[PDB]
Amino acid sequence: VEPNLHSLITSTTHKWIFVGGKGGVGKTTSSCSIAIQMALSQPNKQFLLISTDPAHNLSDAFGEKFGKDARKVTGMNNLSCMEIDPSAGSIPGIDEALSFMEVMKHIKRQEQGEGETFDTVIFDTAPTGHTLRFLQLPNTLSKLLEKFGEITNKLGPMLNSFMGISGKLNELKANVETIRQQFTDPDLTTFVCVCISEFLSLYETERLIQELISYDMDVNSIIVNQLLFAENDQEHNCKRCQARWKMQKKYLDQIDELYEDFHVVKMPLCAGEIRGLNNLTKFSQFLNKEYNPITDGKVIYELE
């Protein structure tokens, strides 16, 4: 497992890119990063980065106004941003459905009014609310149909046909199709999680991944930003910084043992927050090639 998102950044088949991470763990950043890395690596395909965060993180990350109307980020003719409001208890799945169905209407609407078509969409999942809850209802209720359909086959079909397997077939057809909307091919859809080496973060991450696995949604990418690596930076000293990383190193080992076959890309900590297309691309380069605190120390103390 290469601690990078190369295979994904250079993938031309993927058309559904998920990006989650509750806890103000730099979700917005990773999202813009993964979107830029894929757009630059595949200039022969249109990409769309959409967010639902009411804080308009994408507009504050790039430095330009992004609305419900998809607009190409200035300087790039391959990447586009979208900031919509996904809102402007009896039956499970319904609510989630309405929410997602609406976001997809905003997608097809922006592909007709200029933009034409985006090959791969970068979903910047909301900060809170399991917007992927409906990723299990369709398989749920369906399987119940199967228990329903079969059982409804009293002794027979000898006598059931004298008073009346189209049911056992159409069910299996409505079954697969449904399971094909969740499974949505691991080569076509994937989920990228973001976090940091901190107790609470791991707790949030561990559960998030469980939730996705119950959705059968492919997950094999864990982003961990804010890492110090204070044992290599050329300008040592500062116990305060060394102590903090000693703690981050503790958990990081729990992550490398918890997610052994996962793409755990460890991102470096930057002085201030990274904003602007420029500082973003230079920081997202580490998502393609591992960050080396021994040599890439310059690029970091550069964004400062």
Partner 1 sequence: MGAKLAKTLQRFENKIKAGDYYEAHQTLRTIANRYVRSKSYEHAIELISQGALSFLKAKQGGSGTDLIFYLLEVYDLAEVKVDDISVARLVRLIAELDPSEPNLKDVITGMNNWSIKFSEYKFGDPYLHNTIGSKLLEGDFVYEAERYFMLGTHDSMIKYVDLLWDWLCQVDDIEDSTVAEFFSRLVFNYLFISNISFAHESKDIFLERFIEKFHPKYEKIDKNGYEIVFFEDYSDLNFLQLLLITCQTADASYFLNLKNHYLDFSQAYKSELEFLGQEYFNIVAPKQTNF
Radius of gyration of the chain (CA): 22
Binding residues for a second copy restricted to 74-93, rule: CB under 8 A: 74-77, 91
x-marked contacts with a second copy along 228-267 as a string, rule CB under 8 A:
----------------------------------------
x-marked contacts with partner 1 along 252-271 as a string, rule CB under 8 A:
-----xx-xx----------
Position 209 contacts partner 1 (CB under 8 A): yes
Cβ proximity to partner 1, 148 vs 301, nearer residue:
148
- Residue 131's nearest CA partner among 191, 77, 56 is 191
Cβ proximity to partner 1, 46 vs 57, nearer residue:
46
**CB count in 10 Å sphere of residue 231:** 13
The residues annotated with a catalytic role in the active site are: 53
Position 16 contacts partner 1 (CB under 8 A): no
Q: Over the range 161-174, which residues count as b (16 or more CB within 10 Å of their CB) and which as e?
A: eeeeeeeeeebeee
- The site partner of 218 among partner 1, Zn ion, a second copy, none (C-beta below 5 to 8 Å per kind) is partner 1
Q: What are phi and psi of 77, to 5 degrees?
A: -115, 20
- Residue 98's nearest CA partner among 127, 74, 133, 64 is 133
Binding residues for partner 1 restricted to 210-249, rule: CB under 8 A: 210-211, 213-214, 216, 218, 220
SS3 212: helix
SS3 162: coil
* Residues of the shown chain interacting with Zn ion in the complex, contacts defined by CB under 5 A: 238, 240-241
